[PDB]
């Protein structure tokens, strides 16, 4: 019977339950992990390994220059280096998803591109389905 | 629950002139559980109306029909202060508190409970610090083991909280840098008068004499913040409801890291602590482990080899993989650090059963490690174990 809504608006009514039980929970559970060098970062190499890329969302087995260049490689520098820790640039954004903007509203802020037709044109170029 | 449950308590008051004892008018008295009657959190209106009905005619139990004194002053008190914290009584909670504080009744337990009114108050941040502080540590620590099984989560608690919030707050960590950024600035002006004029000499030394006491307040209190991680270990070891207590003490084992003096505060207590209870941790503070005859490295070793000859197999995954993650490319501190670390997994491997387990685990990695390099002929979906050798 029901449009994307009910039920779902009750995992939503769930979703930011969370934080009022505990503010600090999550974050002290992922920054005392954090604080030890994980590799917080997206290694250039493994960048043009995912999307599918290739030809085709699903491409087949090995196929061409086996697999879309065996796609491997490794190595950092200067440039686009995470400050001491980007992790701790993710912290601040955590909370800020966690942060006057109501609690209703974040279902809206779900909802309000949940639906919109915009965002399907902007994705991983193949595989949309709306229904 | 109980519609007529009161209804129920009024025979027994009927048969007055008749009564063997007023004995049963102290019955309702005793009525912690009247207040649970509604106090189970009545949801769907939310539990609010009832329980302030409820203790209404405790006060009464405590005089209407009753001519006593007892502990349910206070008992009834802390209800109140419930339903208070239900419904927005700033201080008024924080009134019957003092209330409560004001008589001499009950055991020094009930000072214990007495102790959340003044973490609540903490909150509200009424009075000094230390004073209250004092208040409830003298109470906490002098009738302890009078009740266990929800006493000690809160009697960490309140000794946990506000030294952490000391150990850090923004406010707080800006007066912590400010004072630390004056000891910086005594250093040079100490190095200055190394090698005139006295007067400068001794405004500095006075300067000196208020920092050194500020420094080491905050440092006893960062003691203090070492204490509180091991009584929230002992609190996982009463008790293993949080991970969120798990994961306080692994900001304070990283500290400890960050703090390399830090580690004899933490020492003695590290013995008793019982960690195999801290499994989503277990990974990384294995892997925090270090190579050095540092009490932290040692710590740490004892603790993983503990975890290994306990139960390696819960977390046998974890150091199995730090095994199998075997780079011989990866070459710093971490290489000693890791060849010291196989040094000491072959020493957990000691034992007879023990090493048989290993065996088994290093084998079974073994065997899975050909079966991801075995990408042999192109064969189809199905693989029989003759295919690899």
Request: proline share 2%.
């Amino acid at each position: 019977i029901t449009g994307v809504e009910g039920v779902f608006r009750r995992c939503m009514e769930f979703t930011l339950e969370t934080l009022r039980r505990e503010e600090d929970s999550l974050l002290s559970v992922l920054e005392v992990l954090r604080y030890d060098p994980f590799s917080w970062l997206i290694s250039p190499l493994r960048r043009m390994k995912k999307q599918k890329m290739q030809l085709e969302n699903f491409n087949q087995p090995e196929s061409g220059n086996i697999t879309t260049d065996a796609s491997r490689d490794p190595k950092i520098q200067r440039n686009n280096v995470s400050g001491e820790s980007e992790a701790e640039r993710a912290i601040l954004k955590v909370r800020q998803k966690l942060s006057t903007l109501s609690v209703e509203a974040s279902v809206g802020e779900l909802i309000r591109i949940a639906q919109d037709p915009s965002y399907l044109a902007l994705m991983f170029c193949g595989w949309s389905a709306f229904q | 629950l109980l519609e007529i449950r009161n209804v129920l308590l009024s025979l027994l008051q009927s048969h007055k002139q008749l009564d063997l004892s007023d004995d049963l008018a102290s019955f309702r008295k005793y009525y912690i559980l009247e207040l649970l009657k509604i106090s189970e959190s009545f949801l769907i209106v939310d539990n609010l109306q009832n329980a302030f009905s409820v203790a209404m005619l405790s006060d009464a139990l405590y005089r209407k029909f009753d001519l006593a004194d007892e502990n349910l002053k206070h008992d009834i008190d802390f209800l109140s202060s419930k339903i208070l914290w239900q419904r927005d009584e700033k201080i008024d909670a924080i009134g019957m508190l003092s209330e409560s504080l004001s008589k001499t009744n009950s055991s020094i337990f009930p000072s214990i409970s007495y102790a959340y009114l003044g973490n609540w108050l903490y909150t509200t941040k009424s009075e000094k610090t230390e004073l209250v502080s004092k208040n409830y540590f003298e109470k906490s620590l002098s009738h302890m083991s009078h009740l266990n099984a929800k006493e000690k989560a809160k009697i960490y608690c309140m000794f946990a909280q506000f030294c952490d919030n000391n150990y850090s707050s923004p406010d707080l960590t800006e007066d912590f840098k400010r004072m630390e950024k004056l000891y910086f600035e005594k250093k040079n002006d100490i190095q200055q008068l190394e090698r005139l004029k006295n007067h400068h000499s001794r405004e500095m030394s006075s300067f000196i004499i208020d920092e050194r006491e500020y420094l080491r307040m905050s440092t006893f209190r960062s003691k203090m913040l070492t204490q509180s991680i091991t009584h929230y270990l002992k609190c996982l070891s009463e008790s293993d409801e949080n991970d969120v207590l798990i994961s306080r003490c692994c900001t304070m084992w990283l500290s400890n890291s960050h703090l390399d003096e830090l580690n004899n505060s933490l020492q003695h207590y590290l013995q008793n602590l019982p960690c195999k209870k801290f499994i989503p941790v277990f990974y990384q503070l294995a892997a925090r482990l270090m190579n050095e005859n540092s009490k932290f490295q040692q710590s740490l070793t004892s603790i993983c080899y503990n975890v290994g000859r306990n139960h390696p197999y819960h977390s046998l995954h974890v150091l199995f993989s730090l095994v199998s993650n075997v780079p011989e490319i990866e070459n710093l501190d971490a290489g000693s650090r890791y060849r010291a670390v196989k040094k000491i997994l072959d020493l957990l491997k000691v034992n007879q059963g023990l090493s048989n387990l290993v065996t088994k685990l290093l084998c079974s990695f073994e065997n899975y490690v050909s079966l991801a390099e075995w990408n042999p002929r192109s064969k189809v979906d199905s693989t029989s174990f003759s295919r690899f050798p």
